[PDB]
Amino acid sequence: ADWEAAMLTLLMMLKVIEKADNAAQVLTALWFMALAAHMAALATPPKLEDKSPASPEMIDFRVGFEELATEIGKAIKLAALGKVKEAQAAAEQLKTTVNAHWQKYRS
Amino acid sequence: ADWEAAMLTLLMMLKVIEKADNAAQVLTALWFMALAAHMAALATPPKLEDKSPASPEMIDFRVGFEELATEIGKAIKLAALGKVKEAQAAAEQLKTTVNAHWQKYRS
Amino acid sequence: ADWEAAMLTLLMMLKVIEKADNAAQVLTALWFMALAAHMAALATPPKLEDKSPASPEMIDFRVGFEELATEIGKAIKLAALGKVKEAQAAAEQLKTTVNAHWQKYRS
């Protein structure tokens, strides 16, 4: 999948997590978020397809995405110990991260 | 998982997508298809375990699988924007791709 | 996700597989197990963060995890051909593998 496809997956997974009841759906959706973030890290946003791969404007993208993956792993571990709500709360903060980053590169 | 395990996953995921109603199940199953295709790309079909890794007969396999992954990403982006049916239709064309390729290397 | 997050995912996925009825939920959960095992292979258990990457005590971890991934692929192929119960039985043996390995590095 390409970059905005994966960011779209992240947004909708967030809608899945928010409306979920048990630990397993939250954890599953969080793992889908993990996969999709990983790929969009390997991908390149459309507005950025014409800047240097060693450009700071692109390398910034690389580390913001590193950040996203980190936060997702944290939330996954909270959903892992079974704290389904503290993990849903981490997902709130996560949607903050995801929205900032999608907005910066949506174009 | 090995190659035919992943092609089997693809076929059954297709059966999941066809009988699905909402956008999220289609998108989830499509992501499972993404993962499984990726791995079977890294794997090697049984009938092909004895041809050169630089063989055209094997390198053909490599690019047909590249094709499959590409089509899956497209269908994922249609299921991402919420076009659950146009994505189900892309999944139809996808089952064409998947069946051709499984048939070529099933043995 | 980090190492114990992925081992926790494996344990709970096992609880999903045991209480499942159809082939598709077993296969899906097994694929989540595949992903999570892969990552925890790339990760490093907390008690092991201070031994050589070429240490036998760490390289042992690397191959025990190789073993786990192998068994998961086998079980996935049984769940692929639709043998939902023989795959549930492989999942029994799998929980043996997973528990041994989580116990060895839990700390």
Coordinates of C-alpha atoms in Angstrom, one line a residue:
Chain A
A1 CA 0.0 0.0 0.0
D2 CA 1.1 3.6 -0.5
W3 CA 1.5 6.3 2.1
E4 CA -1.9 7.9 2.2
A5 CA -3.5 4.5 2.1
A6 CA -1.7 3.6 5.3
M7 CA -2.5 6.9 7.0
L8 CA -6.1 6.3 6.1
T9 CA -5.9 2.8 7.6
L10 CA -4.5 4.4 10.8
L11 CA -7.4 6.9 11.0
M12 CA -10.1 4.2 10.5
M13 CA -8.4 1.8 12.9
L14 CA -8.6 4.5 15.4
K15 CA -12.3 4.7 14.8
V16 CA -12.4 0.9 15.4
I17 CA -10.4 1.2 18.7
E18 CA -12.7 3.9 20.0
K19 CA -15.9 1.9 19.5
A20 CA -14.5 -1.4 20.8
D21 CA -15.3 -3.1 24.0
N22 CA -12.8 -5.9 24.7
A23 CA -9.1 -6.1 24.9
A24 CA -8.6 -8.3 21.8
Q25 CA -10.2 -6.0 19.2
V26 CA -8.2 -3.0 20.6
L27 CA -5.0 -5.0 20.4
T28 CA -5.8 -6.4 16.9
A29 CA -6.6 -2.9 15.6
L30 CA -3.4 -1.6 17.2
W31 CA -1.4 -4.2 15.4
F32 CA -3.0 -3.2 12.1
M33 CA -1.9 0.3 13.0
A34 CA 1.7 -1.0 13.6
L35 CA 1.8 -2.7 10.2
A36 CA 0.4 0.3 8.3
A37 CA 2.7 2.8 10.0
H38 CA 5.6 0.6 9.2
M39 CA 4.8 0.6 5.5
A40 CA 4.0 4.3 5.3
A41 CA 7.4 4.8 6.9
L42 CA 8.9 2.9 3.9
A43 CA 6.7 4.9 1.5
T44 CA 6.9 8.6 0.5
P45 CA 4.1 11.2 0.8
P46 CA 3.0 12.7 -2.6
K47 CA 4.0 16.2 -1.8
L48 CA 7.4 14.9 -0.7
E49 CA 8.2 12.8 -3.8
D50 CA 10.4 15.6 -5.0
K51 CA 12.8 16.4 -2.1
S52 CA 16.1 14.8 -1.3
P53 CA 16.2 11.5 0.6
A54 CA 18.9 13.1 2.7
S55 CA 16.8 16.4 2.8
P56 CA 16.0 17.6 6.3
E57 CA 12.4 18.1 5.1
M58 CA 12.2 14.4 4.3
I59 CA 14.3 13.2 7.2
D60 CA 12.0 15.0 9.5
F61 CA 9.2 12.9 8.0
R62 CA 11.3 9.8 8.7
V63 CA 11.7 10.6 12.4
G64 CA 8.1 11.8 12.9
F65 CA 7.1 8.4 11.7
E66 CA 9.6 6.8 14.0
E67 CA 7.7 8.6 16.8
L68 CA 4.4 7.3 15.6
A69 CA 5.6 3.7 15.6
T70 CA 7.0 4.2 19.1
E71 CA 3.7 5.5 20.5
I72 CA 1.9 2.6 18.8
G73 CA 4.1 0.0 20.4
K74 CA 3.5 1.6 23.8
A75 CA -0.3 1.5 23.3
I76 CA 0.0 -2.1 22.2
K77 CA 1.8 -3.0 25.4
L78 CA -1.0 -1.4 27.5
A79 CA -3.6 -3.3 25.4
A80 CA -1.4 -6.4 26.0
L81 CA -1.4 -6.4 29.8
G82 CA -5.2 -6.2 29.3
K83 CA -5.6 -2.6 30.3
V84 CA -8.1 -2.2 27.5
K85 CA -9.1 1.4 28.5
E86 CA -5.7 2.9 29.4
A87 CA -4.9 1.5 26.0
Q88 CA -8.0 3.2 24.5
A89 CA -6.7 6.4 26.2
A90 CA -3.2 6.0 24.7
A91 CA -5.2 5.6 21.4
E92 CA -6.6 9.1 22.1
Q93 CA -3.1 10.6 22.4
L94 CA -2.2 8.4 19.3
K95 CA -4.9 10.0 17.2
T96 CA -3.4 13.4 18.1
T97 CA 0.0 12.1 16.7
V98 CA -1.6 10.5 13.6
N99 CA -3.6 13.6 12.7
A100 CA -0.8 16.0 13.1
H101 CA 1.4 13.9 10.8
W102 CA -1.3 13.2 8.2
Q103 CA -2.1 16.9 8.0
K104 CA 1.5 17.8 7.5
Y105 CA 1.8 15.6 4.4
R106 CA -1.8 15.1 3.1
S107 CA -1.5 17.2 -0.1
Chain B
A1 CA 4.6 -19.2 6.8
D2 CA 5.7 -20.9 3.5
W3 CA 4.6 -20.0 0.0
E4 CA 1.5 -22.1 -0.5
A5 CA 0.4 -21.3 3.1
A6 CA 0.4 -17.6 2.1
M7 CA -1.4 -18.2 -1.3
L8 CA -4.0 -20.1 0.7
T9 CA -4.4 -17.2 3.1
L10 CA -4.9 -14.9 0.0
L11 CA -7.6 -17.2 -1.4
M12 CA -9.6 -17.4 1.8
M13 CA -9.2 -13.7 2.6
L14 CA -10.8 -13.2 -0.8
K15 CA -13.7 -15.3 0.4
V16 CA -13.9 -13.1 3.5
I17 CA -13.9 -9.9 1.4
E18 CA -16.7 -11.1 -0.9
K19 CA -19.0 -12.0 2.0
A20 CA -18.3 -8.8 4.0
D21 CA -20.6 -5.8 4.6
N22 CA -18.7 -2.9 6.1
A23 CA -15.5 -1.1 5.1
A24 CA -13.4 -2.2 8.1
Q25 CA -13.6 -6.0 7.5
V26 CA -12.7 -5.5 3.8
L27 CA -9.8 -3.3 4.7
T28 CA -8.6 -5.7 7.5
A29 CA -8.8 -8.7 5.2
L30 CA -7.0 -6.7 2.5
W31 CA -4.2 -6.0 4.9
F32 CA -3.9 -9.6 5.8
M33 CA -3.6 -10.2 2.0
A34 CA -0.8 -7.6 2.0
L35 CA 1.2 -9.3 4.8
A36 CA 0.7 -12.8 3.2
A37 CA 1.7 -11.7 -0.3
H38 CA 4.8 -10.0 1.1
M39 CA 5.9 -13.2 2.8
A40 CA 5.2 -15.5 -0.2
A41 CA 7.3 -13.0 -2.2
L42 CA 10.1 -13.8 0.2
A43 CA 9.4 -17.5 0.0
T44 CA 9.9 -19.9 -2.9
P45 CA 7.2 -22.2 -4.5
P46 CA 7.9 -25.9 -4.2
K47 CA 8.2 -26.6 -7.9
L48 CA 10.6 -23.7 -8.1
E49 CA 13.0 -24.7 -5.3
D50 CA 15.4 -26.0 -7.9
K51 CA 15.9 -23.1 -10.3
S52 CA 18.4 -20.3 -10.3
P53 CA 17.7 -17.3 -8.0
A54 CA 18.8 -15.3 -11.1
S55 CA 16.8 -17.6 -13.4
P56 CA 14.3 -15.9 -15.6
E57 CA 11.8 -18.6 -14.6
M58 CA 12.2 -17.5 -10.9
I59 CA 12.7 -13.8 -11.6
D60 CA 9.3 -13.9 -13.4
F61 CA 7.9 -15.2 -10.2
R62 CA 9.4 -12.3 -8.3
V63 CA 7.8 -9.7 -10.6
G64 CA 4.4 -11.4 -10.9
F65 CA 4.4 -11.2 -7.1
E66 CA 5.4 -7.5 -7.3
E67 CA 2.3 -7.1 -9.5
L68 CA 0.1 -8.8 -6.9
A69 CA 1.4 -6.6 -4.1
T70 CA 0.8 -3.5 -6.2
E71 CA -2.9 -4.5 -6.9
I72 CA -3.4 -5.2 -3.3
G73 CA -2.2 -1.7 -2.3
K74 CA -4.6 -0.2 -4.8
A75 CA -7.5 -2.1 -3.5
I76 CA -6.5 -1.1 0.1
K77 CA -6.6 2.5 -0.8
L78 CA -10.1 2.1 -2.3
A79 CA -11.2 0.4 0.9
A80 CA -9.4 3.2 2.8
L81 CA -11.4 6.1 1.3
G82 CA -14.4 4.1 2.4
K83 CA -15.5 2.9 -1.1
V84 CA -16.2 -0.5 0.3
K85 CA -17.8 -1.8 -2.9
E86 CA -15.4 -0.4 -5.5
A87 CA -12.8 -2.0 -3.2
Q88 CA -14.8 -5.3 -3.3
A89 CA -14.7 -5.0 -7.1
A90 CA -11.0 -4.4 -7.1
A91 CA -11.0 -7.6 -5.0
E92 CA -12.7 -9.4 -7.8
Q93 CA -10.0 -8.4 -10.2
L94 CA -7.5 -9.3 -7.5
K95 CA -8.8 -12.9 -7.3
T96 CA -8.1 -13.0 -11.0
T97 CA -4.5 -12.1 -10.3
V98 CA -4.1 -14.4 -7.3
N99 CA -5.6 -17.4 -9.1
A100 CA -3.4 -17.1 -12.1
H101 CA -0.4 -16.9 -9.9
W102 CA -1.3 -19.8 -7.6
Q103 CA -2.1 -22.0 -10.5
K104 CA 1.3 -21.3 -12.2
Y105 CA 3.2 -22.5 -9.1
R106 CA 0.8 -24.7 -7.2
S107 CA 2.6 -28.1 -7.9
Chain C
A1 CA 6.1 -2.9 19.8
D2 CA 8.8 -4.2 22.2
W3 CA 9.6 -7.8 23.1
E4 CA 7.3 -8.5 26.0
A5 CA 4.4 -6.7 24.2
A6 CA 4.8 -9.1 21.3
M7 CA 5.0 -12.2 23.6
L8 CA 1.9 -10.9 25.4
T9 CA 0.2 -10.6 22.0
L10 CA 1.1 -14.2 21.3
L11 CA -0.3 -15.5 24.6
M12 CA -3.6 -13.7 24.1
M13 CA -3.9 -14.7 20.4
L14 CA -3.6 -18.2 21.7
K15 CA -6.6 -17.5 23.9
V16 CA -8.4 -16.3 20.8
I17 CA -7.5 -19.4 18.8
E18 CA -8.7 -21.8 21.6
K19 CA -12.1 -20.2 21.8
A20 CA -12.7 -19.8 18.1
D21 CA -15.1 -21.8 15.9
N22 CA -14.3 -21.2 12.2
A23 CA -11.2 -21.5 10.1
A24 CA -10.9 -17.7 9.4
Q25 CA -10.6 -16.5 13.0
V26 CA -8.0 -19.2 13.7
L27 CA -6.0 -18.2 10.6
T28 CA -6.3 -14.5 11.3
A29 CA -5.1 -14.9 14.9
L30 CA -2.3 -17.1 13.7
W31 CA -1.2 -14.4 11.3
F32 CA -1.2 -11.9 14.1
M33 CA 1.0 -14.4 15.9
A34 CA 3.3 -14.4 12.9
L35 CA 3.7 -10.7 12.8
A36 CA 4.3 -10.4 16.6
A37 CA 6.8 -13.2 16.7
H38 CA 8.7 -11.6 13.8
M39 CA 9.0 -8.3 15.7
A40 CA 10.0 -9.8 19.0
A41 CA 12.7 -11.6 17.0
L42 CA 13.9 -8.2 16.0
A43 CA 13.6 -6.9 19.6
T44 CA 15.6 -7.8 22.7
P45 CA 14.2 -9.1 26.0
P46 CA 14.9 -6.8 29.0
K47 CA 17.0 -9.2 30.9
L48 CA 19.1 -9.7 27.8
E49 CA 19.7 -6.0 26.9
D50 CA 23.2 -6.4 28.4
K51 CA 24.7 -9.4 26.7
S52 CA 26.7 -9.6 23.5
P53 CA 24.8 -9.7 20.2
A54 CA 27.2 -12.4 19.3
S55 CA 26.8 -13.9 22.8
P56 CA 25.6 -17.6 22.7
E57 CA 23.1 -16.6 25.4
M58 CA 21.6 -14.1 23.0
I59 CA 22.1 -16.2 19.8
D60 CA 20.2 -19.0 21.6
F61 CA 17.3 -16.5 21.9
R62 CA 17.6 -15.7 18.2
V63 CA 17.2 -19.4 17.2
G64 CA 14.6 -20.3 19.8
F65 CA 12.6 -17.5 18.2
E66 CA 13.4 -18.9 14.7
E67 CA 11.8 -22.2 16.0
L68 CA 8.7 -20.3 17.2
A69 CA 8.2 -18.6 13.8
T70 CA 8.6 -22.0 12.1
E71 CA 6.0 -23.7 14.2
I72 CA 3.6 -20.8 13.6
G73 CA 4.0 -21.1 9.8
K74 CA 3.2 -24.8 10.1
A75 CA 0.0 -24.1 12.1
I76 CA -0.9 -21.4 9.6
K77 CA -0.7 -23.9 6.7
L78 CA -3.0 -26.3 8.6
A79 CA -5.5 -23.5 9.2
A80 CA -5.0 -22.7 5.5
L81 CA -6.2 -26.0 4.1
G82 CA -9.2 -25.5 6.3
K83 CA -8.3 -28.1 9.0
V84 CA -9.5 -25.7 11.6
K85 CA -9.0 -28.2 14.5
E86 CA -5.8 -29.9 13.5
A87 CA -4.6 -26.2 13.4
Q88 CA -6.2 -25.6 16.8
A89 CA -4.2 -28.7 18.0
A90 CA -1.0 -27.3 16.5
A91 CA -1.9 -24.1 18.5
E92 CA -1.8 -26.3 21.6
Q93 CA 1.7 -27.4 20.9
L94 CA 2.4 -23.8 20.0
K95 CA 1.4 -22.5 23.4
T96 CA 3.9 -25.0 24.8
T97 CA 6.7 -23.4 22.7
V98 CA 5.5 -19.8 23.4
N99 CA 5.3 -20.4 27.2
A100 CA 8.7 -22.0 27.4
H101 CA 10.2 -19.0 25.6
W102 CA 8.4 -16.3 27.5
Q103 CA 9.3 -17.8 30.7
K104 CA 13.0 -18.0 29.8
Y105 CA 13.2 -14.2 29.2
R106 CA 10.2 -12.7 31.1
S107 CA 12.3 -10.9 33.8

